[PDB]
């Protein structure tokens, strides 16, 4: 059996798990050598019961956009690290006494439970292939159906109640993304991007030396601009203080910041004056910065991310869709709290995110080999290994799901992740029958990223308009296309 | 080239839908085992004391006396 | 080609005797027997007029003695305890406490 | 005293109940259909005279027998 | 806080009274009966009892059983034993020495405890 | 209530509607009049590029 | 229905096979499978039309 197929390498094995140990060391060095220097500082937040940790990719997941690595060797990291996830039950013996050797021959039968050491194949993405097709597909295959129930009833709620809580704007692209297993058809991301109306709007409050500022695509804009210019301190400084003060008398105009009138959010006014402190009429005592002059109003390099996700909030979720959420990633999920597995995904989305980072920097994805981009699909959880598509419906995968985690929210991922999950068994053996058209493909160019797209509203669908029927689509397009014909 | 989202069955696909209807009929199968087996619990009782009674029926549950 | 077990039509015909059972089907019909037959009517007062019965053979005659008897003399005593018991000459003729 | 959603047995919408199969070609086999079974016993009833009387004629012979 | 919910009619109360007189209008029903053989012995007056007009009904029902109609008699016999026992007892010559020894379920036996 | 024990599908349909012209409207209107008496010379000067 | 009485008949037979009535099942798949055969002879026509231009 593989029992003693595993034992066989065990004296072999424990070479390369001590180099990999090595290898993983020296690269966790360079990155957090990186990291203390480039990255800022992600404070610790505790949920609204105020008893554990919350995490968001927002503030948590960095991409460090110039780490000087090639993509392979941080794929070589992330499965190392998981290889050291993998090689715990060896902690069985010292804890448990010399009969705490069975757990180790349970986690020697099964390869899947097996670090990188025990296999065959030598390069990383063969090696990653293999443990996916062997066991880790199989493990996806039968969560994805109930952890997309779990998002839906999390969305619809429990006992009859969809009338409270469930949006009549976000019902046909909720049915397109939920249950276009039954139709057979295509998914726009963007109908999963609508499942954001669940939630509020995401807010970003700058912290100056008098007052917070809401951030909007005009600053950000101007601050960008700044930055591209590269002019001296001085000069840039004064600019940002000034695009600065100019959104402060934007935003006080507009009725301040859109946390003033968000429940659960809020800023206080000034304080009040009790009882003989009040001074007649003032009966409130401003701060001390109401003593500085608005003309030095100066950014303190402090942020505060708001998503304000009243419905999508991983807080809200449960001590079981976090579970399944963690298991259809290939995650560790068992005998911890959510805030630890939301730290485990936070962890896998940062990966992810910095993947792509390399991908673009490596000539996007038409430089990768089709095992290579099998493999970032897996990871991905858009793609199982019992499909045997074609190299442009892989590239339009990648580039949705791509597009849907630079939005950084979780749950319109694992919805969208889900549906390629789907699959029946039929009774007979005749059906289903064996297919006359050819097999699915598409291209980068008819995934619709570039533009807009309103809900729909409730039982009056419409049709999927191409991106190249839009006007000036040559030119819109012509990355891609300059990317596809070389 | 075959139709998309289908595939063979699975032992973790579960049993099909005629074994859980047979798991399902288990219980209403028993209940005309059982029910005539309360009324015999029932009938065939006898009460264990009376006035006279010196004894009381024991039973030593793991044999320690 | 049905790749599950075919259940015949015959055991379908088998089961649905046992599964198409209302709720009346079970109350009433196991209710009567057991209405009858049980610890009010029946079962009921033969069982608590042995513990009368056995209280006043004991306190009169002895239950050893009662042992010694014949199955005759024994179901003779046994009457008449049942009838000082039924008749409750101490209590003014009221089975209450 | 109830609210309608009780008495007519759904809160929103009325769910389809699955018909009762019927078996085509054979008697339905329910527990009101056993007496196309089970009739009352008719087959053997004078046989049960000529025993009750031979069971208590027997019975009385050997207790009066015991007895004296 | 200010849902602004639209009226269930489900949640309303307009059909439990008018079920619950469909139900005893059904069973009301089964007292339907012929003028042949029909008698009723009415009170002193001359008007009607209350059991009397409604056995016809629970019998019309009894009629419909299948086990009980066979089964529910069998404690009836039982009626009978009490009446003839009571009368037994009522005048059954006993000893006055064991009435006094071991009288039963009398008041302060200390053999009972009390 | 019976909504299980009926055929609405007819009562409800997709529409029949091109988002395609709500687009084409935004795009006229964003541009200007020059601008679309300027693709009437793209179009003709490329019918004499493929005529040459 | 008779002077002075209505009444319901009811056969007495057993019932080997199951009675069948056609009640026509609605479907929008053969109304699909023509809209694409409509549209497709469109462009056939139109791709026709454009190469007898092209090269007449
Ligand atoms: C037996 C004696 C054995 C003695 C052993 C002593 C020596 C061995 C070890 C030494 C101890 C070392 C210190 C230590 O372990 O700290 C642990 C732990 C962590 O401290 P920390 O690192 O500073 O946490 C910082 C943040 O929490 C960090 O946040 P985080 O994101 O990293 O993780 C947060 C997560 C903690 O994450 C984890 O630690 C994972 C734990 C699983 C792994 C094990 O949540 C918590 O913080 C738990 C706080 C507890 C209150 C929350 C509400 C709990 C509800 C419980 C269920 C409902 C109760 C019944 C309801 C019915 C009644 C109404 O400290 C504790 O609070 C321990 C409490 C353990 C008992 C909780 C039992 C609750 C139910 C009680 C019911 C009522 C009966 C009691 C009256
Ligand atoms: C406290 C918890 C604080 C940290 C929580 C994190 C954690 O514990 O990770 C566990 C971790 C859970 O898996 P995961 O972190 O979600 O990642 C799963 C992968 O993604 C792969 O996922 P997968 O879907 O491929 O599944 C892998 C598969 C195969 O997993 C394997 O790798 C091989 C199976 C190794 C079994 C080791 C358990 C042995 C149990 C004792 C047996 C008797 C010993 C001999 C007689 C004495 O998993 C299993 O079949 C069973 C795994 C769970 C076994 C129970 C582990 C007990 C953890 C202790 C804390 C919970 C109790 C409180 O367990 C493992 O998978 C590795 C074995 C862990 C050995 C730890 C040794 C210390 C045990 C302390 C006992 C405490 C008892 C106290 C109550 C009495
Ligand atoms: C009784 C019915 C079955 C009992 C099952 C309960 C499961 C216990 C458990 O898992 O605890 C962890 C579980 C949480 O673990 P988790 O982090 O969510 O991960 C789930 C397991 O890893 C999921 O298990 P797994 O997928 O990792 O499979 C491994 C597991 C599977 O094996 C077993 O757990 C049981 C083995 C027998 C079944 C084998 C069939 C195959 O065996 C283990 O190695 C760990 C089990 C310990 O605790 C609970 O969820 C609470 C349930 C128990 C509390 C209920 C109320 C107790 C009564 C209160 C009394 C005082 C009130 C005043
Ligand atoms: C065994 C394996 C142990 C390893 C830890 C288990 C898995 C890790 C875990 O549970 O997370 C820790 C859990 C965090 O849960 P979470 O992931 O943050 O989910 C929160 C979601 O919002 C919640 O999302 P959700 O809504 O989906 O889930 C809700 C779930 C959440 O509940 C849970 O967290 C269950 C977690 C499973 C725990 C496993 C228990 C296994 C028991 C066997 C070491 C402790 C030493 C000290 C002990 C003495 C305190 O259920 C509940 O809310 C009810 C919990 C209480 C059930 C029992 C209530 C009994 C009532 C008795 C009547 C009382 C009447 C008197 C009333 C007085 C007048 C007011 O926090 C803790 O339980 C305390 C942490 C430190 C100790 C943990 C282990 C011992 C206490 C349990
Ligand atoms: C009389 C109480 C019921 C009268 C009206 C109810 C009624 O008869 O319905 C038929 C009712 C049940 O219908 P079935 O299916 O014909 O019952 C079978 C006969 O028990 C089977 O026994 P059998 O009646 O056909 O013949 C047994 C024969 C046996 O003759 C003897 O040797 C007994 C000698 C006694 C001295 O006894 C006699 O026929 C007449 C002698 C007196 C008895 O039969 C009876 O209750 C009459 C005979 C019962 C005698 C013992 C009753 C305790
Ligand atoms: C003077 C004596 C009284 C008068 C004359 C004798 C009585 C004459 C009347 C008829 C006979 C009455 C019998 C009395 C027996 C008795 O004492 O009844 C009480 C006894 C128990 O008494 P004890 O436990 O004290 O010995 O129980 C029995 O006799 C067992 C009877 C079994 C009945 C089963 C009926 C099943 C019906 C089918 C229902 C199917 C539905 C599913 C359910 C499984
Ligand atoms: C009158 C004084 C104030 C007290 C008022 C409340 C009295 C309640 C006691 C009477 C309860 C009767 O309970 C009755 O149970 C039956 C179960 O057969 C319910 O029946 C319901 O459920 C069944 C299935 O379970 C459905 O198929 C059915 O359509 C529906 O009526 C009735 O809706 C309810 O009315
Ligand atoms: C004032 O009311 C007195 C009537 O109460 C009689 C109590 O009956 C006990 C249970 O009786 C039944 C039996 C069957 C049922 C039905 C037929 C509704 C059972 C069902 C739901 C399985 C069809 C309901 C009640
Ligand atoms: C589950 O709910 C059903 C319970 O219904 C029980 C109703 O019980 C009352 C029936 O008793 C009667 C009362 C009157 C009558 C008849 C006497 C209606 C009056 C008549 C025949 C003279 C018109 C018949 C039966």
């Known amino acids: 059996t593989a029992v003693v197929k595993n034992l066989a390498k065990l004296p072999a094995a424990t070479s390369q798990i001590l180099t990999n140990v090595s290898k993983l060391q020296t690269f966790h060095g360079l990155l957090e050598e990186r990291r203390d220097k480039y990255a800022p500082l992600a404070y610790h937040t505790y949920d609204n019961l105020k008893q554990k940790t919350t995490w968001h990719p927002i503030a948590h997941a960095w991409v460090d956009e110039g780490l000087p690595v090639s993509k392979k060797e941080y794929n070589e990291y992330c499965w190392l690290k998981k290889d050291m996830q993998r090689l715990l039950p060896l902690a069985s013996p010292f804890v448990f006494g010399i009969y705490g050797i069975l757990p180790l021959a349970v986690w020697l039968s099964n390869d899947g439970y097996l670090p990188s050491a025990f296999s065959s194949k030598k390069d990383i993405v063969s090696k990653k292939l293999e443990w996916y097709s062997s066991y880790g597909d199989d493990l996806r295959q039968q969560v994805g159906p109930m952890l997309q129930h779990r998002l839906k009833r999390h969305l619809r709620g429990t006992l009859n109640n969809e009338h409270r809580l469930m949006l009549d704007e976000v019902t046909e692209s909720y049915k397109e993304i939920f249950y276009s297993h039954y139709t057979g058809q295509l998914r726009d991301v963007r109908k999963c991007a609508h499942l954001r109306l669940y939630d509020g709007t995401s807010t970003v409050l700058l912290l100056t030396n008098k007052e917070p500022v809401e951030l909007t695509s005009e600053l950000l804009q101007k601050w960008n601009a700044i930055k591209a210019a590269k002019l001296s301190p001085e000069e840039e400084k004064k600019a940002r203080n000034e695009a600065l003060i100019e959104a402060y008398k934007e935003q006080e105009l507009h009725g301040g910041p859109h946390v003033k009138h968000m429940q659960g959010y809020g800023i206080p006014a000034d304080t009040p004056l009790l009882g003989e402190n009040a001074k007649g009429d003032q009966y409130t005592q401003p701060p001390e910065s109401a003593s500085i002059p608005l003309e030095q109003l100066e950014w303190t390099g402090d942020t505060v991310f708001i998503p304000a996700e009243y419905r999508t909030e991983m807080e809200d979720w449960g001590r079981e869709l976090t579970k399944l959420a963690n298991q259809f990633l290939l995650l560790p999920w068992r005998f911890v709290s959510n805030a630890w597995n939301q730290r485990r995904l936070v962890s896998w989305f940062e990966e992810i995110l910095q993947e792509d980072a390399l991908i673009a920097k490596e000539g996007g994805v038409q430089a990768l080999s089709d095992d290579e981009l099998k493999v970032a699909l897996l990871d991905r959880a858009v793609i199982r290994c019992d499909e045997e598509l074609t190299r442009g419906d892989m590239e339009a995968r990648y580039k949705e799901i791509s597009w849907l985690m630079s939005l950084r929210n979780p749950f319109i991922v694992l919805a969208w992740q889900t549906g390629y999950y789907r699959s029946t068994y039929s009774p007979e053996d005749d059906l289903p029958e064996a297919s006359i058209l050819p097999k699915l493909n598409r291209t980068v160019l008819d995934v619709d990223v570039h533009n807009e797209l309103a809900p729909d509203h409730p039982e009056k669908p419409l049709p999927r308009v191409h991106p190249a029927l839009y006007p000036n689509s040559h030119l819109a397009l012509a990355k891609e296309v300059a990317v596809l014909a070389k | 080239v075959p139709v998309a989202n289908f595939r063979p069955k699975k032992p973790w696909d579960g049993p099909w839908g005629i074994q859980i209807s047979q798991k399902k009929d288990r219980p209403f199968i028993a209940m005309w085992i059982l029910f005539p087996l309360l009324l015999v619990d029932h009938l065939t009782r006898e009460y264990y004391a009376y006035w006279h009674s010196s004894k009381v029926p024991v039973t030593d549950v793991f044999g320690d006396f | 080609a049905p790749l599950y077990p075919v259940l015949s039509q015959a055991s379908l015909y088998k089961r649905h005797f046992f599964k198409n059972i209302k709720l009346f089907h079970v109350v009433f019909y196991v209710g009567a027997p057991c209405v009858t037959f049980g610890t009010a009517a029946w079962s009921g007062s033969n069982r608590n007029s042995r513990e009368a019965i056995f209280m006043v053979i004991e306190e009169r005659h002895g239950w050893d003695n009662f042992k010694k008897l014949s199955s005759h003399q024994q179901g003779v005593i046994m009457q008449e305890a049942a009838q000082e018991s039924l008749l409750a000459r101490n209590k003014g003729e009221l089975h209450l406490p | ?68 | 806080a200010a849902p602004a919910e639209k009226p269930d009619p489900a949640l309303d109360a307009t059909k439990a009274l008018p079920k619950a007189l469909e139900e005893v209008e059904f069973f009301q029903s089964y007292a339907v009966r012929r003028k042949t053989g029909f008698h009723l012995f009415n009170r002193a007056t001359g008007s009607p009892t209350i059991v009397g007009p409604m056995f016809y009904n629970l019998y019309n029902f009894v009629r419909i059983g299948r086990v009980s109609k066979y089964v529910c008699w069998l404690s009836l016999p039982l009626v009978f034993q009490r009446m003839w026992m009571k009368n037994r007892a009522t005048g059954m010559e006993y000893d006055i020495d064991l009435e006094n020894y071991a009288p039963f379920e009398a008041k302060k036996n200390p053999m009972h405890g009390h | 209530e019976e909504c299980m024990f009926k055929d609405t599908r007819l009562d409800v349909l997709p529409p029949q509607v091109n988002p395609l012209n709500a687009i084409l409207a935004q795009h006229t209107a964003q541009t200007p009049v020059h601008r679309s008496l300027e693709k009437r010379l793209w179009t003709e000067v490329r019918a004499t590029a493929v005529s040459e | 229905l008779m002077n002075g009485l209505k009444m319901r008949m009811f056969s007495l037979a057993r019932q080997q096979a199951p009675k069948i009535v056609h009640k026509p099942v609605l479907s929008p798949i053969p109304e699909h499978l023509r809209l694409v055969k409509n549209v497709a002879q469109v462009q056939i026509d139109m791709l026709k039309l454009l190469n007898a231009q092209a090269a007449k």
């Open chain 4, 1 to 68: 005293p109830l609210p309608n959603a009780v008495v007519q047995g759904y809160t929103s919408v009325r769910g389809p109940k699955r018909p009762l199969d019927h078996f085509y070609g054979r008697t339905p086999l329910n527990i009101d259909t056993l007496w196309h079974w089970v009739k009352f016993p008719h087959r053997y009833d004078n046989l049960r005279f000529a025993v009750c009387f031979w069971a208590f004629l027997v019975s009385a012979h050997f207790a009066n027998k015991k007895q004296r």
